[PDB]
Amino acid sequence: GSGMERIKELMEMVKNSRMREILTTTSVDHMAVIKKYTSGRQEKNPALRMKWMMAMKYPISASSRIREMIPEKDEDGNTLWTNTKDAGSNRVLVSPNAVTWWNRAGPVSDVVHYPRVYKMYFDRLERLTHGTFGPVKFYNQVKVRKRVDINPGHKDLTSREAQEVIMEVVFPNEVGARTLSSDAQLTITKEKKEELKNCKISPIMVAYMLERELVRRTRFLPIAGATSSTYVEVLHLTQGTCWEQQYTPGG
Amino acid sequence: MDVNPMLIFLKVPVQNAISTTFPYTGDPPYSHGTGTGYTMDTVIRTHDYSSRGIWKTNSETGAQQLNPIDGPLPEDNEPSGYAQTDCVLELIEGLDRSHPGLFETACQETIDAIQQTRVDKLTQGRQTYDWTLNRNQPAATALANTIEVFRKNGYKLNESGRLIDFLKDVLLSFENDSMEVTTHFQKKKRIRDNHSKKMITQRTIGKKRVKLTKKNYLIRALTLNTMTKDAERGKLKRRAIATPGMQIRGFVYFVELLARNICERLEQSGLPVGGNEKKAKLANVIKKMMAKSTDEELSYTITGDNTKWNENQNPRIFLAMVLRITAGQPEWFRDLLAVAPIMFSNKVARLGRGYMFESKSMHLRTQISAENLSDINLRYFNEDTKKKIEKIRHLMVEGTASLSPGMMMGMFNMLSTVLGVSVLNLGQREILKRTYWWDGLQSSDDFALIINGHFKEDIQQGVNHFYRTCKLVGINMSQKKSYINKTGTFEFTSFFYRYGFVANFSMELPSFGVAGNNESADMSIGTTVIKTNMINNDLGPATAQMAIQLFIKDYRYTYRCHRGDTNLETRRTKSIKRLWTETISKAGLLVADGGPNPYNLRNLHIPEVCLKWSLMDPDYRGRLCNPNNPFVHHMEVLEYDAVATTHSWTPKRNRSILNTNQRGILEDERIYQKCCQVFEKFFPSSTYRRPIGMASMLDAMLSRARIDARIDLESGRISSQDFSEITNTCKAIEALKRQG
Amino acid sequence: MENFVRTNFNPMILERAEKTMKEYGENPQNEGNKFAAISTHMEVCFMYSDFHFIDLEGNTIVKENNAMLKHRFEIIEGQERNIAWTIVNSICNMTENSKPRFLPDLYDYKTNKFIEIGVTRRKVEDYYYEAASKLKGENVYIHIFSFDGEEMATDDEYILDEESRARIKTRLFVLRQELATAGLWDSFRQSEEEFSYPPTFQRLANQSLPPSFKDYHQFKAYVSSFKANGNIEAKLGAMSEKVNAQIESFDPRTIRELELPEGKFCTQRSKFLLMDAMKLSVLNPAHEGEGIPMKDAKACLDTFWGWKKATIIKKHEKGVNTNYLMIWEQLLESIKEMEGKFLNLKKTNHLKWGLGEGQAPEKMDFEDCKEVPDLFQYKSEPPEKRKLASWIQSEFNKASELTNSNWIEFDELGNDVAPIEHIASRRRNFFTAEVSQCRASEYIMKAVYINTALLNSSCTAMEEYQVIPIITKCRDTSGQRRTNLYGFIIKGRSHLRNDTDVVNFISLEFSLTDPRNEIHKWEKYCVLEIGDMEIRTSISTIMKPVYLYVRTNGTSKIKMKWGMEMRRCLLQSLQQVESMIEAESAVKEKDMTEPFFRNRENDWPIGESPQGIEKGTIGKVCRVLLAKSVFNSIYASAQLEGFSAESRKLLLLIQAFRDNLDPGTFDLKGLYEAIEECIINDPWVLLNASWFNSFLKAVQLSMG
RNA sequence: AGUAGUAACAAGAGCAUUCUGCU
């Protein structure tokens, strides 16, 4: 029983008349419009609303599985979750003491893919930690809005090719008419399919991990100095309005 | 000794300490009540600058329209709206002669972008005036309601998926005399509130199908929603801005795309540039006009604002400009780009939310709407509203006022820049053949014009020639708010140039506080906001350090996450103190978990969990980055690993409205969410890359289910009983699709 | 015709062909032979796929009448494009086949082969070899049918039975005969963008022209065939001479001063008392609440022995003052007996009056108010003008002075590594060390605490009359904590739905200032006398009365939001000073932090004594800039923003004269009128206008 | 009364560009 659960879910949804009308009338191009459909009063100040929502006992709404993972009362007597008034749905009101209790007395696990998913930021930190700073020099600054390489990507793969590589790796049936037209593309594809054999992770997560490893982004920025890819990340640090910090990234 | 901070200007120059003259730490002036009076003031001022035009009635809407252009020339320095068509076409022809191939290349890029743009581009941007609901819904909600009302009538070209077919449907919808729309209505009943024993009328907002006319749909399609602008700095009195409808958004998108392709290659435009590109443009116009061809060349600079910039530019001048820029182009492209000035010349302005009337004998009040204002006796108003209603009475068409002259604030923001840059491009040395020349820099309505000559009389003659040529095309330089000095110090859109030093104060300094999503999201947003202001909004190093300290202080107050060694006793301080006392390396704890502040000037680009990862306890980094945490939502495949930390939780939401039973209208959003969720169940890539298609959602999901059952049958884990059950259920779903 | 298609084909084939035509974007009026050809090819593919099964053993058994078996052919043609490509990719991922260049029309699970089926009207040989050259390389079984009555496949192999192709060719001959009877055979065999205006939008297009034109096509042909013959110069000859921008020369030694308004004196409009505030403090508090603000308020009230019977010293002239006295007596009696963390007062008549409950008229709908005779509009009046009084300059004098406490404790930073981090740390530490003990920092912390607690009590205690104390917490020079209490705020009812809905409150503030010396400052206040206090000094030790300033005030979510963020004043005052250091370093090309912050001479003019202009140091300048930002935040209005924006031009004009850049205006009188339009009744904007007049007189006397 | 300022709030549609602890 694998594909009959979602097919009976679709049968239950088509049993409703309004959902049948909406599923039959809205095309797959129009589902990119009704995904962002929002009918309701919008909070005009989320900062102020978080300020006065955090002053209440239960500002978090997490799933009902938290009724079995964490207790209801802490060691010092702090209540961690309460239910809602006549709402037995899979969402209960939680306390931030529950979050602190999970971070101090919850179950440990294995964390080996968190430096693998976020290897871009760990590469940034390893390049900044081993960087070697020079002195500051004060003069007037002439900074040009150049399309510099913020995310380097991969060699011999454009932005139009790396996204197709990722879509062939993690979503191989949902491609379309696109075809792979390089000789190192197939070796990269075989290596990425080999590395992602045993992943109990969401496919969007490995999709975005391969995106931040392979897809090259460029953005216009005022640069006065080295326009290499490892200098645009420290663009808030190596230049200002009246000075220029000299810095060589480690590596 | 009385303290005077302005005497600080006796030591330093004014541009070196101009930030003292920006009182941007207090609350900005908000508007109270309605935006009806400011809308009627905008309409009356727009018709009063243009009052010597030609009054006519529209053949379709019945609205009184005023035609100021090609009218009498101005006789005084009042702001005129009488733009001349021959001068506008000569200025666009001169802008074409100075930049050869600019118009052709920008039109070719616009044609290349017209055929490849989908309807989903209209889900972006600001909130759009929904003509269905007479309210400012978001862009995707208004677009979905417009597509639903088109599809429930006989207009279904927007099912092709491209934007130009939706625009052809918009244009074809004007012929239907029986447009049937599904609006929102409201029932009411007086229910006793069981908290104070008080009778209050509770309202139940539902849905109802109502039928329009041809004229009613034509008024609603040509309606802008006018509201006051709030949090606006630098003005004593408020103003009304407008929001376009859905039948004009795509045409305005294509016209502004054309004008953005024009303005990106004109060096005399202050759009669409950022901060440091605008500093570079100030330096470029100061170096272009510094070339002393002789020994005695007087170079003066006018820092200028334009008075009543939107009230004086007509949509007919923009129609002539968009027909002259697109010369030699295909006629479908010329007509498609000419739709938006035609719709803006025939436009109408919704008159806000009425007024509030007070009964002192019965001690009550009632907000009467703007549609009821034309049938209430004029003695029930104040003097200013009496004057405004008596002036606007002949312009009202079905609760809205006709606004055929003038533009509203921010609609054609890039095309008026093309007109201003054409006026600036008129005065070159090899074109004027006169004893003066100029070169300028043109934003939406601010300008910085540099006139060079040989004597000061030549500078005055260049000033008069620029000002009168601006008056010929509907541009009134504000003589109150403009001043001329020599070249070397000036101001352009709150960029203060002094002798090669530009001070940027266009952007207000942000709060540098909590954003309000969750703990990890606000930490990332706060460090990214500080880093972006260090790069693009010109924040100092020590000011950025104080912004880091202020953000960390505010973040620790808001989420109650002070350090473990604090003597403060908040709600979470006992659990945070327990976590602090049992942690070996306290430097690895997050700020949300009572750890120290890891951030400084050098590492604002690094996330917090990444920055402290080598200092965490292994049990603490296991509990924090646990992929089975109950706070982050877990998608079913058993569920996947959660790669987000436990501080990425979700706050409890309140979209409630007082005494309002909005059950009949909040259902469609959750139905659309269930449809997108089950489509993501069938097609797992629908959230990463948007799915392209033209069949229905149910047909694509049944076609996915049938071949998924067939592939799983022919390659293992699904038996023929399971395959037969899936195919029979697909037959049953198609059978309910037929006879539903 | 299309009716020839709809006569004899299946309706499901008609549905598939209609969807195939709607894919490419065409109506069946321009091309109906496409409809007939797509329906013919689709029915050929369907009859190729009709009744071809595979049982559980796996043999091709043609059945008629699904439950124990499955299909042999997967139909690819007739679906959508992306649906068919998902079908092709889902087949090729399982069978490890290469994807074809285009979409095949069928798939055989038995032969594991993509079938491309093509129905033509020309000869079968040329079309078969054209399709084989079209699909050269891809392992695709081709099958070409025609109306000529033949069939041509790859390697002459037929995966279908003989009766199957006999049925298909029989149907093809039936279609061939049915085409050559209704006169449709030869007309079927031998086979930019568009944006036009509908007539309603054509009438809208004719209405939106210059008045010399009646047709949109005529105006479009005029604009596309326009050639300029000197039109701008002819109109500039025709235009009047009164339209001119005449440059008037600007000399600040001849320009006049700003006209400040006249009337009554401007009253105090701050939410809390600034320089008249008195605090009851506890040093090193540990009193079993220790942080809960009502516990701190009781612990600070327990330090003041020497209460009296309160009597109304100075009456609020518009309001009932006995209500204010009873409000203070009720608050003092309820604090002495409260149990818990929060105190909600009993809604008596005087408290209902002071918080203004019941003053709003009952909001009804207009259809229930149609028969209401006396239904006049809300009145909208401009503010009444006020004369500048000398108390606000004294407030700004006392706000830029040092104290004994340390009011701001910033959080920690990371350890500094870069040299620019050390430079920024030195600069920020210099500014903090000069600015942290200022009185404006005490006002920053007072506003942060008051507006934070007012927001929390406004959102969690909406229906209740909450008491909110005015707490600050400071550290002394020896590093000892101290908790100060300035008064109380009785919050009203706060159901705030807009950003500008008013929550009313009652502020009762302790003070030592006799209110009858500057009575015009205290128009809205009702001042009582609540006690006596031994004021001690080096020699003198007296018993001065302790007063209580009671007033009704109000605020909103916007004002409370911007009051909780008043520490940004601390940012802005650092952003200014550092920019000065980021100007002197943009010329002298060194780190100008230490010449700025160690040459503590008296070369910074910030004062106006009767003997001339007084100069302070750089630390005095940073305290004055902080107090200016604090008073910009406390006394914010539209008048301040308008005056600042319109007087900045006059400041830049004076600077343009001082650089010998020969400034000139086009209309200086209108600029003066726009500046004087904004100086109405805010005490801070009147003080800033008199400051601009004093700076103008100083910049005149520096040149004569 | 008070906030406020071209029109509103001072509860009974928000018509958008059980809690409150900041050294």
DSSP-derived secondary structure for C128-183: HHHHHHHTSSS-EEEEEEETTS-EEEGGG--SS-HHHHHHHHHHHHHHHHHHTTTT
Question: What fold does the segment set C1-189 form as a domain?
Answer: Restriction Endonuclease (3.40.91)
Cα–Cα nearest to B484, from C649, C658, C253: C649
DSSP character for B614? G
Which residues, including other chains, have CB under 8 Å from residue B505's CB and lie 6 or more apart?
B18, B19, B22, B494, B495, B496
Q: How far apart are CA B352 and CA B42, in angstroms?
A: 12
**Judging by beta carbons within 10 Å of its beta carbon (0-12, 13-18, 19+), is residue C605 exposed, middle or buried?**
buried
Helix ranges (H only) for C261-418 are 293-301, 321-335, 349-355, 391-399
What is the DSSP code string of B666-729?
SHHHHHHHHHHHHHHHHSTTTTTSPPP-SSBHHHHHHHHHHHHHHHHHHTSSS-HHHHHHHHHH
Q: Which pair of tokens denotes residue C605?
A: 């003019």
C36-39 long-range contacts (CB < 8 A, ≥24 apart) are C36/C2, C36/C4, C36/C5, C36/C188, C37/C119, C37/C188, C39/C5, C39/C9, C39/C13, C39/C14
Q: Residue B63: inside a domain, yes or no?
A: yes
Quick count: other Cβ atoms within 10 Å of Cβ A164? 19
Domain boundary among B501, B531, B551: B501
Residues 6+ apart with CB under 8 A from B292: none
Same domain, B537 and B634: yes
Spell out which residues of C between 555 and 614 contact strand D, using CB within 7 Å. Answer: 555-556, 559, 564
Chain C residues contacting A via beta carbons under 8 Å: 81-82, 85-86, 89-90, 93, 99, 417-420, 423, 452, 455-456, 458-460, 499, 557, 561, 564, 582-583, 585-586, 588-591
Instruction: Check CB contact under 8 Å for C585 and A243.
Output: yes
Distance CA C380, CA C390 (A): 30
Q: How far apart are CA C696 and CA C704, in angstroms?
A: 13
Q: What are phi and psi of B547, to 5 degrees?
A: -70, -35
Distance CA B617, CA B589 (A): 8
Q: What is the DSSP string of B332-392?
A: HHHHHHHHHHHHHHS-EEE-TT-EEEEETTTTEEEEE-SSGGGGS-GGGS-HHHHHHHHHH
B19, part of any domain = no
Half-sphere exposure of C116 (CA within 13 A, CB side): 20
- Token pair belonging to A139: 């003069």
Q: How far apart are CA A235 and CA B536, in angstroms?
A: 10
Closest CA to B733 of A30, A2, A9: A9
Q: Give the residue from C54, C61, A176, C84 showing the smallest Cα distance to B714.
A: C54
CB C418 within 8 A of CB A133: yes
Same domain, B470 and B576: no
B697 and A23: CB-CB below 8 Å? yes
- Touching A (3+ Cβ pairs <8 A), the chains are B, C
Q: Report the C-alpha gap between C571 and C576 in whole angstroms.
A: 9
Residues of B with Cβ-Cβ distance to C246 under 8 angstroms: 460, 464
Nearest of A82, A108, A80, A73 to residue A96 by alpha carbon: A80
Asked if residue B51 belongs to a domain, the reply is: yes
State the total domains in chain B.
4
Closest CA to A33 of C201, C583, C390, B151: B151
Q: Is the torsion defined by CA of C285, C291, C292, C296 positive or negative?
A: positive
Give the Cα separation of C102 and C118 in Å (integer).
13
Count Cβ neighbours within 10 Å for each residue of C155-185 and write b for 16 or more, e otherwise.
Answer: eeeebbeeebbeebbeebeebbeebeeeebb
In this structure, are B35 and B89 located in the same domain? yes
At B678, list the tokens: 């089950």
- Which whole-number Å values give the CA distances from C129 to C41, C132, C152, C189, in the listed order? 19, 5, 10, 20
Radius of gyration of chain C from its Cα atoms, rounded to whole angstroms: 44
Distance, in angstroms, between A103 CA and closest chain C CA?
23
What domain range includes position B284? Answer: 266-306+412-501
Q: Is B13 a domain residue?
A: no
d(CA C129, CA C127): 6
How many residues does this entry show for chain A?
A: 251
B159 and B69 both lie in a single domain: yes
The angle, 0 to 180 degrees and rounded to 10, between the axes of the packed helices C231-238 and B85-98 is 140
Q: Is there a contact between A61 and B653 if contact means CB atoms under 8 Å apart?
A: yes
Compute the distance between CA of residue C587 and CA of residue B721 in angstroms, rounded to an integer. 84
Last residue of one domain, picked from the residues B371, B386, B411 = B411
CB within 8 Å of A17: residues ≥ 6 apart? B740
Pairing between β-strand C140-146 and β-strand C113-120 as defined by DSSP bridges: parallel
Per the structure block, which two tokens stand in for C308? Answer: 């009296």
Distances (CA, A) of C471 to C259, C334, C474, C504: 41, 19, 10, 20
CA dist., res. C182 & res. C386, Å (int) = 97
Say how many C-beta atoms besides its own lie within 10 A of residue A86's C-beta. Answer: 5
What are the residue ranges of CATH 3.40.91.90 in chain C? Answer: 1-189
In whole angstroms, give the CA distance from residue B171 to residue C605: 67
- The full DSSP string for C477-499 is TTS-EEEEEEEEEEE------ST
Q: If we measure between CA atoms, which residue out of C116, C117, C110 comes closest to residue C73?
A: C110
Q: What is the rounded CA–CA span in Å between residue B64 and residue B69? A: 16
- Please indicate, yes or no, if residue B17 is contained in any of the structural domains: no
Tell me, yes or no, whether B491 and B507 share the same domain: no
Whole-angstrom Cα distance, residue C473 to residue C481?
7
CB A100 within 8 A of CB B575: yes
The DSSP string of C300-337 is: HHTT---EEEEEEEE--SSS-HHHHHHHHHHHHHHHTT
- The sign of the dihedral angle between the CA atoms of C674, C680, C685, C688 is positive
- Distance of alpha carbon B116 from the chain centroid: 23
Q: Which residues in chain B have their CB less than 8 angstroms from residue A36's CB? A: 123, 138-140
Q: Which nucleotides of D are covered by protein (CB under 7 A)?
A: 1-23
Whole-number Å distance between alpha carbons of A59 and B304: 51
Residues A197 and A190: beta-carbon distance below 8 Å = no
Antiparallel, parallel or unpaired: β C386-387 and C264-265: parallel
Protein residue at shortest CA distance from C1' of D3: C554
Terminal alpha carbon distance of chain A: 52
Counting Cα atoms < 13 Å in the Cβ hemisphere of C378 gives 16
Asked, for residue B247, whether it belongs to a domain, the answer is yes
Same domain for B287 and B391?
Answer: no
| Interchain CB distance below 8 Å, A99 and B631 | yes
Beta bridge partners of B162: B118
Q: What b-and-e string marks burial along B376-388, b requiring 16 or more CB atoms within 10 Å of the CB?
A: beeebbbeebeeb
Cα–Cα dist B405/B416, whole Å: 15
Q: How was it solved?
A: cryo-EM
For chain C, the distance separating the N- and C-terminal CA atoms, rounded to the nearest angstrom, is 100
- For residue A97, the SS3 value is helix
Helix C419-435 × helix B541-558 angle, to 10°? 70
Tell me if B87 is assigned to some domain.
yes
Of B411, B440, B462, which residue is a domain's last?
B411
Per-position b or e across B197-233, b if 16+ CB within 10 A of its CB: eeeeeebebeeeeeebebbbbbbbbbbbbbbbbbebe
Radius of gyration (Cα) for chain B, nearest Å? 31
Q: Are C266 and C685 in contact (CB under 8 A)?
A: no
B282 and B228 within one domain: no
- What letter would DSSP give residue B108? H
CA B323, B328, B330, B331 torsion-angle sign? positive
User: Which residue gives the smallest C-alpha to C1' distance to D10?
Assistant: C360
Q: Which two tokens stand for residue C256?
A: 């006049």
Which residue out of C102, C292, C468, C585 would a mutagenesis test of the A interface target, given it has the greatest number of A Cβ atoms within 10 Å?
Answer: C585
Sole residue written with tokens 């964390």 = A111
B675 close to A23: Cβ distance less than 8 angstroms? yes
Residue ranges of alpha helices (H) inside B152-294 are: 163-172, 214-221, 249-263, 275-288
Tell me the three state secondary structure of residue A243.
Answer: strand
Q: Spell out which residues of chain B touch residue C208, defining contact as CB-CB under 8 Å.
A: 315-316, 319, 341-342, 345-346
C 250-289, residues with C-beta < 7 Å of strand D: 269, 289
Cis ω before C373 (30° cut-off from 0): no
Work out the angle at residue B604's Cα, subtended by the Cα atoms of residues B599 and B610, and round it to the nearest 5 degrees: 75
CA of B540 to C1' of D3 (A): 38
Instruction: Check residue A81 and report its DSSP letter.
Output: E
Q: Measured between alpha carbons, how far is B424 from B378 in angstroms, rounded to an integer?
A: 48
End-to-end CA distance of chain B: give it in Å, rounded.
87
Q: Do A27 and B572 touch (CB under 8 A)?
A: no
Element spanning B137, H or E: strand B135-137
Is the separation of the CB atoms in C516 and C313 below 8 Å? yes
Helix count and strand count (H, E) for chain A: 11, 7
Nearest-CA neighbor of C38 among C55, C51, C20, C50? C20
Instruction: Answer yes or no: are the C-beta atoms of A98 and A80 closer than 8 Å.
Output: yes
Number of residues assigned to chain B: 740
CA proximity to B35, closest of B234, B225, B307: B225
Element (H, E) at C528: strand C526-536
